[PDB]
Amino acid sequence: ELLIRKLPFQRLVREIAQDFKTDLRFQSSAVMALQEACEAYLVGLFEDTNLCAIHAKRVTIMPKDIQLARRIRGERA
Amino acid sequence: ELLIRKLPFQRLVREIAQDFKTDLRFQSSAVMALQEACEAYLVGLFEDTNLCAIHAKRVTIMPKDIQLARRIRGER
Amino acid sequence: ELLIRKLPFQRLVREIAQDFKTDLRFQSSAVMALQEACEAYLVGLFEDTNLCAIHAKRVTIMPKDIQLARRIRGERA
Amino acid sequence: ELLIRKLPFQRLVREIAQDFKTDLRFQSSAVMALQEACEAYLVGLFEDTNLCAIHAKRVTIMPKDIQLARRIRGER
Amino acid sequence: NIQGITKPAIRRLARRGGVKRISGLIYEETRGVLKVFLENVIRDAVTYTEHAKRKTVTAMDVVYALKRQGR
Amino acid sequence: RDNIQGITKPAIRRLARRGGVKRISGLIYEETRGVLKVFLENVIRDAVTYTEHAKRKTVTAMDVVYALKRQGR
Amino acid sequence: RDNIQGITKPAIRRLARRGGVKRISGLIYEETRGVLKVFLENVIRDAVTYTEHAKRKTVTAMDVVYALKRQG
Amino acid sequence: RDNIQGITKPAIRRLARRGGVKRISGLIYEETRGVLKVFLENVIRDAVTYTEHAKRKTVTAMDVVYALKRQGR
DNA sequence: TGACACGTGCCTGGAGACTAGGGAGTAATCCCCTTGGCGGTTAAAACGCGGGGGACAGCGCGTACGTGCGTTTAAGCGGTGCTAGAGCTGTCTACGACCAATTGAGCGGCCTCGGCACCGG
DNA sequence: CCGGTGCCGAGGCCGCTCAATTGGTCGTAGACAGCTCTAGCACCGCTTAAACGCACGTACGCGCTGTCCCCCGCGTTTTAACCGCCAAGGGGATTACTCCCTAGTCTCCAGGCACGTGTCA
């Protein structure tokens, strides 16, 4: 399944697209593939930040844990 | 600027290559590139494990920090 | 012989290579080896997914069967 | 940690080694490494047979599940 | 906009990621992270659309963008 | 059609028959195409690397053999 | 004198729990033991092969690591 | 000693200092050595493959650069 | 010759097997609609002759170009004994920050229709 | 030279889960100390970077030759896509069942250690 709601994600994607380029429409299948990819990326990042929190002798993940996970992974953070 | 000693690392490279293919001779430039890249990779891994140690309110890196850094980077 | 038609597989390989390096030109022997290897790999994958299908008491194979076969054999699934 | 008892594994590996060559002793470190390896292999095979059972509309793993997992992996 | 990825959705994503307990501030932080990710992928996606002179983003454009943002 | 469509439905059917498959879901064909594409991409990516190492412009059979060996094949 | 029976049922259950298994048929344990024996034989066979090549009489940790590599 | 011991404790300490590490547990050194072997093995495996593709008996710098690129460093 | 592995003994908590209880996941069956398998067909991409053109792979050779070695040394570097101190780690505490639950409702998703944007046979 | 597919916007319904507010509670950052371990000082060995000869395997570049890759026509060709009928079955529901999950107790033992003994490069 898809954990993120379809219509809000569509709206956000259209917002960022209109920021980049105007009158650049997306297919439903392209939006579905992009949403699947983003959900996979988010669940992977949450797995990594859960590993970070477990490493810090804790059970509740924090924003600094996600920051550390993204800094170690190699993203722009 | 090569922190690892040249002759021990060369001997290690030769030993590791004995398994893959026997009687293989390395160019000096090849061993230099291997040493430079291994040093850069170890420096990056140590930066990441130091970040992990600072995350846990510590200053002493521990093997669990190295395993965490390798698991996050996709190596474990 | 080769179950896959020669020219479609050749065109697909040439397209993938033109993605990777663009200027590449294939020998006939290289394309034949690629085709033989891909056919053998797909035959093995279909055999393993047939095992997975018979495991669930279904004569028909399903995409979930192939996903399971790739997950167990070590491939990314 | 380790989930298999150490002394029964020692006696088992001793009986298994007795067949090929008589009284070729093992360092305790080698026995511990082999036990860790068997631990990893068994837990991986049980994960695979759990995937098989979840794929077969079941929750209980069965001998046919682990046999199918081993045959798909390529062991036997 | 970015606020449409609601708090219970982010909680569900974290649950699927194996997270048992979740700080309240993560959600705002995660949203920022998500936006950056999306921007980057879409930027590449749009580049592919514009480079091919098709003006229509295709499913393949997105797949290629994602690959080149994860290779 | 896109070149991925050149791996036709009857070809995938034949591959499944050789694999001992008696009945085949309609979604198998698309799934197989995706899997095949991934496999091919990986092999060819290695193959082209080998080609570049030899400073050649023609991918040879040996390039493919090394790519296949270095993969699970 | 079966030594394979020293790997008890609760140990195999624990291994399955670590593998994420929630429910376990009773016959798996005997099956698992057979599987385990085969694995060990193969690994040890390679280990001993390496040992014999090295003409040593003490199997070392490196022998086992090489056996495992050449098996896995 | 075995060649893995040639990456000495002070060398690993120097690498850690350059990596910004201020304090180092005694168990790190052996662990680091293990990590290095895996990395080297992978790179060297590819390097030797390249050497074999060129039908050479001398591993060149270029073999290593291609191995390193394809192993992500 | 000196460090490492094997056989005995006690014992105490730590764990393994048994059977009492049961219930819940597993095993056999039916049919409903789905959906592959197969019969016809035709043409549209496949696939070998055939001239043909040639960019480029494969091989042979010269040459110097970089590898490996005998031998030194010395000196910067490593193994190590001992120490003072700085941090790891186990523990107490308390309170801001987490999890569940119900209630109005506000936006998702399905249903449908008017409108055009557009690369294309 | 116009056309079928799809996107955008709007009317309008159900529907279902979203936010807030409450309660409950918990678990984590700070303080505190026992421990331990380690960075460094100082000594003495050591073994590595470099420098001489010294010989030498061979990497690489250049050139020659063939040689198969690309090109198209093109005739045949044959089988892929599509459509329609036949019927095999996926599976959701149903009903029985049986055997595996707890688990307390009786009983076996893991290993800690303490010791004595034999062994191998």
Residue numbers in the entry:
A (entry chain C), C (entry chain G): 59 to 135
B (entry chain A), D (entry chain E): 59 to 134
E (entry chain D): 25 to 95
F (entry chain H), H (entry chain B): 23 to 95
G (entry chain F): 23 to 94
From the manuscript:
In the present study, we determined the cryo-EM structures of a nucleosome-like particle, the H3-H4 octasome, which has unique features not found in the canonical nucleosome. In these structures, an ∼120-bp DNA segment and four copies of H3-H4 dimers formed a stable core particle without H2A and H2B. A novel H4-H4’FHB, assembled by the helix–loop–helix regions of the two inward-facing H4 histones, connected the two disks. First, the H3-H4 octasome lacked the acidic patch provided by H2A and H2B, which functions as a docking site for a variety of nucleosome binding proteins.
Single-particle analysis identified three well-resolved structures, indicating that the H3-H4 octasome exists in alternative conformations. The structure showed that the H3-H4 octasome has a core composed of two (H3-H4)2 tetramers, forming a left-handed ramp allowing ∼120 bp of DNA to wrap around the core 1.5 times. Each (H3-H4)2 tetramer engaged an ∼60-bp DNA segment on either side of the dyad to form a disk. In the nucleosome, the H3-H3’ FHB of the (H3-H4)2 tetramer coincided with the nucleosomal dyad; however, in the H3-H4 octasome, there were two H3-H3’ FHBs, and they were positioned at the superhelical locations (SHLs) +3 and −3 on either side of the dyad (SHL 0). Second, the αN regions of the two inward-facing H3 histones were predicted to occupy the interdisk space of the H3-H4 octasome; however, the expected alpha helical structures were not visible, suggesting that the H3 αN regions in the interdisk space are dynamic. Finally, the FHB at the octasomal H4-H4’ interface resembled the one at the nucleosomal H4-H2B interface. In the H3-H4 octasome, the same H4 sidechains were oriented in a similar manner, but they interacted with the sidechains of Arg92, Tyr88, Asp85, and Asp68 on the opposite H4’ instead.
